[PDB]
Symmetry: D5
Subunit: 194 residues, 10 copies
């Protein structure tokens, strides 16, 4: 599986602050967590709500040492045209993170989210830790938007267990909730408490 | 990819009501939505919290015409032993849904959740509709527990767009929130309504 | 070669009069000549000048029983967004012919104009006769715009020799110019005249 | 595709000034632009009009640092026989550029213009820059003559954008017309200037 | 065949004294004989009688410089749960030897005891000498328990012929019985009696 | 694996009552249990003690509806020459069961007991039930003789659990000892002899 | 080998009487012997002497129920241009037999006369009987012209042995010379003389 | 094709002066032209007339720095038996050149004259120049004898154009007839013996 | 092995009574035993002595329902020339049996006696019964001639056991000698009389 | 073919003087001629007569620098049991040469005498010279015993021509008989004396 292993590296053109840049995924290793989400096409319907939802809460991810990266098979010129469209008109407005262009579809293919039939990507999202290892996947069919909240929760759980490597996070864990020690003897400390 | 296609069928033994039964995944086609979640091993730590979290809210899924199915590579005798252990002792107590045994590991293989190094499954969860099609995938590494709330949300979004085939669900959609029509002309109806 | 043989058939989504339609190339067989031109990407620079140039002279092609079809690897949503952009802003405005979407890149691949490196098509143009046979190719690198005039000339020559199957068109032939009979004995009638 | 890449090199005999010479395509790299055009056969009909049309305007290409090269599958003895036939008799008369013999058909094969059924080349024309890279392709079926004017236009556009690497040539561009900068911000300078 | 050759080596997790340890089979080479037995699954019926049967007599095997190793496809968490159950409740109680986990099933596969249809091992038992060579195999279908007595007999025969490499053991040989020299001329001393 | 599946069928010549006969293994299906044991070579040392040991107790197996079959890679002419040798001279004397000749070695090969290096069989023994399914394997290296007593115990346990299909035999079970009637709880929808075997 | 077997059939365009025709080699089966000769290229030097040499003596071959076919890799347009040139200007003038175009080079390839390096045929000549069988091959390198006399001699020998199938032709046989019967006992009549 | 390229080399036993010798074809390179002719079998009918015809005119070839070599699939013992047979009896008598034995048939095979159906060679003749390059081929079916006169003509034409490397021989050329000095117009940059050959 | 199986069939031209015939090996099945011997080459040295030895004793084989067949890779014309050569001159003289020509060497190849290095056959001899099955092979290197006496003995033993299918022939068996019954209990008749 | 080439080497256990030895065929190279004969099985019927026939005349072969080697697929224990059986009882009695055991059947396989159907060897016999090259093979089907006399004759002829490398042995050659020189002109000495 992809989860539990190093992410497939890529180097691609992207749009950031309405300028054309390059983004190399491995360049974030050692530096930040990465939330990499794919969406099907520019100028669609669920996709702008996801993209701007993540843009509006980007400060929360930046303060948690996490970068957000959006990817679709569109070119950087579609990306740029869409950034310059008003949100009220179905556009994106200005974005707080890079919009990555996968024109060759190799990135979507390497993450297993490419629908070969249609040449577009599913709504797949991947949380990558500072060592470059994929720790989480959410993959939705095209009609169902994802959740910034659940992405935030999963990310906080990952950072929590990586700072306290002797803990694991129970179902529904939030910051402030009790964790547990994955040990037949010490986990009882949790199981008695409830 | 798995999402967007018919689920790989299986027929496997399971523990239900402390009895041994058989479960065939395709038997739910035409009848119920399926939430199929894998966990690594019996007598572990995050896994019991996931299993009982879903069991305690099983009635809510039952009201939504959805069955929950837990799967791991352990045998049905380990499953039965774990159900008969108290929750206070790290056990499951009584379960409201079948615990399926993937003893040959073929089910985990077909859903791409098997860590071949270790012979156990990742924390993969799959939502399957009444036609047997996978519509949602959640896959966590072994240490991070999942969320029954987000599973409930995604399942409800799927049911909404399947009853209203002209709608799609925006980011963060919950029941009661506005959806939109995936049409460049009718989408403006949703878009020109956000201050 | 592609030229001299039946065009590779396709069925694809397209934008026409700002609506989503389907276009099947073989459906024009027996009905009209087809001028099929590929361009690299939506929201570029030479491409809008080519697309609108052909749009403005579309009546000349319609009166000659010829349809124009543009193709790129962009989706119909980019196509539609670009049609709804003003020409003064680098957009296309309203188009007189369909804009075809090759999201899977199979069409560009089958016509041999796909740059595999970049996932976009070269500036290839193909004139297809009423039997579906490719009779002409113009393929330019990305920086050089094509010519509506030379396309018109080549098309008029093709229709001329197909109406008078005993004639062929010399270099630079225009309507009104003398043709010749490709026959060792009758071609002399041309060669003496000049 | 051929366009956008280095041309397939060849070394072949040719007729020039009614003498037998050798021509190596890569020998023009670093020195001149190359217009390489194929024609099907000697002693035919459209082909002599193309060949002499280019010969009569050869001086214009020579002024543009460009050589013209004609190629067909005929031998150099047929080529020489055709040059020595009067134009009034369907011949070539004197030619200003080499006529290359593709007797083994390997050159036509490498440029994708060989009709394998018939063993002759289509009316393919290729523009090659000083680095040896194909920048333009014209391929006609056997009955439709080509245009020296459009070849001149495309060659001049190529030379313009290669001397001005920040420019691109719009549709129908001729020398003296405005070009544009392929940049979403600087392109508006061209676009907001057309009534 | 497996018997007569070096055992397929493995490194696996196991439960011993209610702790998780590692066991590498080649680590016993030069040190002890190994009695390596597979059983199908934890929390079953015949298997606990075999496992505890070997545990109760482990001192007899240890005095013979022999270690016992139990293996099944269950994880160490099932193994530990089963050890921490009393024998009266269907458990194993405390064991005198390691319970090995073959969670990937590769060990059962390499010893040819994996029923691929069912993903569990047959009741296969292997006697391995100090050089790491398989000398004996007992493989039962799931319903028939094995016998610690016959394992002890076979191990004693193997140890006898390895300490007296010029002897071989006749049918039913027990310590104290006559052996014979596998030689046409010297066997006659045995058959004449 | 071989155990748990139908035995590989064979048809071979054999020595019985000092005459050359044919034996087809599938012919015992429906009729008798089979104790099929291999030994490496004729005129050896452990092998005659095993062979005569089984012949001397053959009546006990006959009363249990069981036939014994010995197999080796020697020909029937070796088998007959060895049967006609006195036991005091290392021979077999007359035997109560057939001695099967595996000259082409395909039989040893199909049962996985052929040492390819040496062209002889290990001391493999196989207990086969009335449906032809191998239920037990004992495979010894060449120097260690087998036990007729343990073969009898395993055979008796197999016959017990097949006659009482709800029972299983614990470790070390002998006739007269308690068996086990396990009670895996299957639902009645599933209920219509697998799980009590583990 | 080609000699002794049916010729590779072909259908090709040719020039005859300054007109474009088609020639299919199997169309001559049952009707005429075929003298099929290849030459390298049109507008050369040895080749016209061979082509016109055969043309000037075509009546001698036609009286023997034999057609001559010339083949080169040039097109019919080169062929026609060369025919319409006078012999005094290096041309062929009018020809008594078809000039075949092997523009795809497949015919030369199938008769093994194609020099692949140069894309032209050697000076190969083949005599084909009324059943379509190759009976004789003459293959020269480019600088040595062939001989119409030896072609006539070989054709006359082949026709002789096919009309008298019990005879064979000795070395240098011409019409009027003694033949022999290929038989150990009847050959003696020949060798005794 | 064979013609225009170096001959396939061979080394074979042969009969010469009623003794067994060896012949290696590459040994003539730099030294003599070679007329290498195959015939199907010894003790036949067209073949002796060809063989004796070449032997009787061998001096004419010797004076032209040319060796003749006959080859067939028969052994040297057949060749010697046939040489020792009188010509009036269908034999060869003594020969002026070696008779080469192709018992393994590799020689006939390398020259493409082996009828695989029958294991014998067609009446193939090959003229090889001093550099070892085949310049001419005549291949007759088994019933048609070849012509020593035409071999002489072709050989003389080859020697002429190789001694006068600017000339070529028209159709039917004989010594004394006009040759041709063609004048293909190559540029002096290209000018430093191909094109006048066509 | 060849011995014990049907001989590889062939059809080949041969010389018999100084005439050309065809010989098909399977045509002797049911009719005669066959002694098929190969020799290396015509006009050699050991081979003529073998061939004439078999011809001189051919009547003894004919009375035993046996044909002799000699085979070498030479043609029928070499064979005929050699038959018409006097024995004092190294020839064969008149032959009582056919001389078969294996020009394509397929026969020598199928009986495994062809020296591929040299294209000739070894001194292999095969005794074939009326059913077409090879019962004996003798294969000598080129310098060691074979023995007609031993061929007659082997043939006579084969005919004996095929006439008395319950008997087998001990070492050195000749007509008049004791046979034995290949049975443990019946062979005692032969064994007990050993002196 | 095997005849004319180095024999396939082997190393095998054998019985000699009622002891177990090892025998390596290449160890006889340079030292002795080898008569290597296969027989089908121990305790059979033709085979003991062959084995004892060779043992009884072994001294004649020993004086000719020749060893005898018998081979069958039986084990050395069958071999020893058979040697220790009386000849009147179908046994061998004491043997003058080694009995080799081919239990894995590789030796019979490499000499082409193994009947794969039955796993036993044919009655194949091979004469091997001091250089290790097979010069003669006799292969009989199971019922026809071989001849020690013909083996001695073939061996004596081989030794004769290897001692006189300019001679070859005609058909039926025995010591004292005329040889011949395999040369067209020298063979006339033999041929001209034919009566």
């Amino acid at each position: 599986p992809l989860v539990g292993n190093k992410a497939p590296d890529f180097e691609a053109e992207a749009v950031f602050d309405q300028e054309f840049i390059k983004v190399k995924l491995s360049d974030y290793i050692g530096k930040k967590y990465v939330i990499l989400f794919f969406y099907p096409l520019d100028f669609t319907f669920v996709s702008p709500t996801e993209i701007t939802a993540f843009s509006d809460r980007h400060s929360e991810f930046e303060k948690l040492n996490t970068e957000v990266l959006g990817v679709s098979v569109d070119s950087v010129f579609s990306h740029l045209a869409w950034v310059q469209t008003d949100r009220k008109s179905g556009g994106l407005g200005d974005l707080n993170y890079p919009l990555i262009s996968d024109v060759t579809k190799s990135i979507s293919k390497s993450f297993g989210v490419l629908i070969h039939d249609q040449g577009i990507a599913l709504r797949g999202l991947f949380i990558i830790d500072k060592e470059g290892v994929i720790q989480h996947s959410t993959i939705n069919n095209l009609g169902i938007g994802r959740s910034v909240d659940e992405t935030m929760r999963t990310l906080q759980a990952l950072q929590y267990i990586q700072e306290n490597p002797d803990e694991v996070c129970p179902a529904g864990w939030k910051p402030g909730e009790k964790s547990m020690k994955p040990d037949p003897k010490l986990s009882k400390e949790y199981f008695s408490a409830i």
